[PDB]
Enzyme design. Structure first.
Site, short mmCIF file in Angstrom:
data_model
loop_
_atom_site.label_atom_id
_atom_site.label_comp_id
_atom_site.label_asym_id
_atom_site.label_seq_id
_atom_site.Cartn_x
_atom_site.Cartn_y
_atom_site.Cartn_z
N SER A 50 0.76 -1.25 0.00
CA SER A 50 0.00 0.00 0.00
C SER A 50 0.79 1.31 0.00
O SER A 50 0.19 2.37 -0.19
CB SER A 50 -1.00 0.02 1.16
OG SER A 50 -1.98 -1.01 1.03
N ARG A 230 3.02 -1.58 13.60
CA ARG A 230 3.88 -0.77 12.75
C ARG A 230 3.87 0.66 13.27
O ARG A 230 4.91 1.33 13.33
CB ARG A 230 3.38 -0.79 11.31
CG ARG A 230 3.51 -2.14 10.65
CD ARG A 230 2.72 -2.18 9.36
NE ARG A 230 1.31 -1.87 9.58
CZ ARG A 230 0.37 -1.95 8.65
NH1 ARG A 230 0.70 -2.35 7.43
NH2 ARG A 230 -0.89 -1.64 8.93
C1 LIG Z 1 -5.67 -7.85 -4.02
O1 LIG Z 1 -5.62 -8.10 -2.64
C2 LIG Z 1 -6.78 -8.12 -1.82
O2 LIG Z 1 -7.89 -8.41 -2.26
N1 LIG Z 1 -6.63 -7.78 -0.51
C3 LIG Z 1 -5.98 -6.93 0.36
C4 LIG Z 1 -6.23 -6.99 1.83
C5 LIG Z 1 -5.53 -6.05 2.71
N2 LIG Z 1 -4.62 -5.11 2.07
C6 LIG Z 1 -3.81 -4.04 2.80
N3 LIG Z 1 -3.75 -3.73 4.17
C7 LIG Z 1 -4.48 -2.87 5.16
C8 LIG Z 1 -5.54 -3.74 5.90
O3 LIG Z 1 -5.73 -4.92 5.69
O4 LIG Z 1 -6.42 -3.13 6.96
C9 LIG Z 1 -3.40 -2.20 6.12
C10 LIG Z 1 -4.01 -0.89 6.73
C11 LIG Z 1 -2.95 -3.16 7.29
S1 LIG Z 1 -1.88 -1.78 5.18
O5 LIG Z 1 -1.04 -0.90 6.01
O6 LIG Z 1 -2.29 -0.99 3.74
C12 LIG Z 1 -3.05 -3.37 1.61
C13 LIG Z 1 -2.04 -2.15 1.90
O7 LIG Z 1 -0.80 -2.91 1.79
C14 LIG Z 1 -3.38 -3.95 0.44
C15 LIG Z 1 -4.33 -5.00 0.70
C16 LIG Z 1 -5.02 -5.94 -0.23
#
Ligand SMILES: COC(=O)Nc1ccn2c(N[C@@H](C(=O)O)C(C)(C)S(=O)O)c(C=O)cc2c1
Length: 244
Positions: A50, A230
Site C-alpha cells: 500500500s 507498525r
Molecule cells: C488484491 O488483494 C486483496 O484483495 N486484498 C488486500 C487486503 C488487505 N490489504 C492491505 N492492508 C491494510 C488492511 O488490511 O487493513 C493495512 C491498513 C494493514 S496496510 O497498512 O495498507 C493493503 C495495503 O498494503 C493492500 C491489501 C489488499
C-alpha cells in the site's frame, strides 16, 4: 544526554518485543540513520504494498485520471473489509487503505502510462510488469527501505516531478497523527500476498518549527500480528529519538 548506544538499544528492543525482524530509517537533512533489530534490511528490496498508493495517487491526479473530490462508488460487490464497501474519494481511500479504489485508479491510468510514469519517477526497481492492478502487491515492483525514506523526503519537500499542487494534494491525504505540535504524515503497507509478508509505515514528521524529518519503518509481518504494531514501534522510535 542520551548516548547513541542507548537509542540504538531502545529502538532495537521495540522490534524485539514485537517478536519480528525490522528496521526504521530516519533522514535528517541529507543524513540517513538506520535503527532496529535487523539493519541489513535497509538495502533489501520488498514489494511496496500500500505505500505505492502515494505514487498511484500522484500519477492519477497529474494525468487527470481523477480529482481530489471525485467519489469512487462502491460497485456493491463483497470486499475484504466492510469498511471498503462504501463510496470514497482518493483521500478517504488512502486513509482506509482501500485497494479497490486504487486498483480502479490504476486501471484508469493504464499499463502503458503507469509503466512510463513509474519509470519517470524512478520508484524502486521501477518495473511494474504486465498486470496494471496488482504489481505493487505481489511483484515485480520492489523497493528498499532506503529508497522509501528518500521517496518520502522528496514528497515532503515537493521534489518529485509533479506539479506543486498535485504533491500538496496528496500530502494532505497522508496526515495520520498530531503529537505535541508535531504532525505525522505517513502511509502504511502490508504485503500479505507475498512470503514472507512485509510491513511498512513510510512518511515524515513535520515539527512545529516547520522542519520535516522523513522515515520508513520496514518489518516482517507475522500471523496474529496487529497492523498497529507498525505504528506503535514507529511512534516509540520517533519519541525515543526526540523527533516527536
Ligand atoms: C488484491 O488483494 C486483496 O484483495 N486484498 C488486500 C487486503 C488487505 N490489504 C492491505 N492492508 C491494510 C488492511 O488490511 O487493513 C493495512 C491498513 C494493514 S496496510 O497498512 O495498507 C493493503 C495495503 O498494503 C493492500 C491489501 C489488499
Amino acid at each position: 544526554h542520551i548516548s547513541s548506544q542507548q537509542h540504538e538499544k531502545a529502538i532495537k528492543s521495540y522490534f524485539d518485543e514485537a517478536q519480528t525482524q525490522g528496521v526504521i530509517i530516519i533522514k535528517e537533512g541529507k543524513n540517513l540513520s538506520t535503527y532496529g533489530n535487523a539493519l541489513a534490511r535497509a538495502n533489501k528490496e520488498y514489494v511496496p504494498a500500500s505505500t505505492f498508493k502515494m505514487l498511484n495517487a500522484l500519477i492519477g491526479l497529474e494525468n487527470h485520471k481523477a480529482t481530489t473530490n471525485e467519489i469512487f462508488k462502491w460497485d456493491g460487490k463483497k470486499r475484504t473489509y466492510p469498511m471498503w464497501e462504501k463510496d470514497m474519494t482518493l483521500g478517504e481511500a488512502m486513509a482506509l487503505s482501500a485497494v479497490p479504489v486504487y486498483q480502479e485508479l490504476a486501471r484508469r491510468t493504464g499499463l502503458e502510462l503507469m509503466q512510463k510514469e513509474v519509470k519517470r519517477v524512478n520508484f524502486g526497481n521501477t518495473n511494474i510488469g504486465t498486470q496494471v492492478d496488482n504489481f505493487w502487491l505481489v511483484g515485480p515492483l520492489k523497493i528498499t527501505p532506503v529508497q522509501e525514506v528518500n521517496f518520502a523526503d522528496d514528497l515532503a519537500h515537493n521534489r518529485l516531478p509533479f506539479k506543486l499542487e498535485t504533491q500538496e494534494e496528496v500530502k494532505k491525504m497522508l496526515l495520520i497523527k498530531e503529537v505535541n505540535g508535531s504532525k505525522i504524515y505517513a502511509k502504511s503497507g502490508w504485503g500479505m500476498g507475498v512470503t514472507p509478508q512485509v510491513g511498512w509505515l513510510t512518511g515524515w514528521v513535520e515539527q512545529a518549527n516547520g522542519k520535516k524529518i522523513p522515515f520508513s519503518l520496514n518489518l516482517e509481518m507475522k500471523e496474529g500480528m496487529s497492523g498497529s504494531i507498525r505504528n506503535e514501534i514507529t511512534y516509540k522510535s520517533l519519541e525515543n529519538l526526540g523527533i516527536i
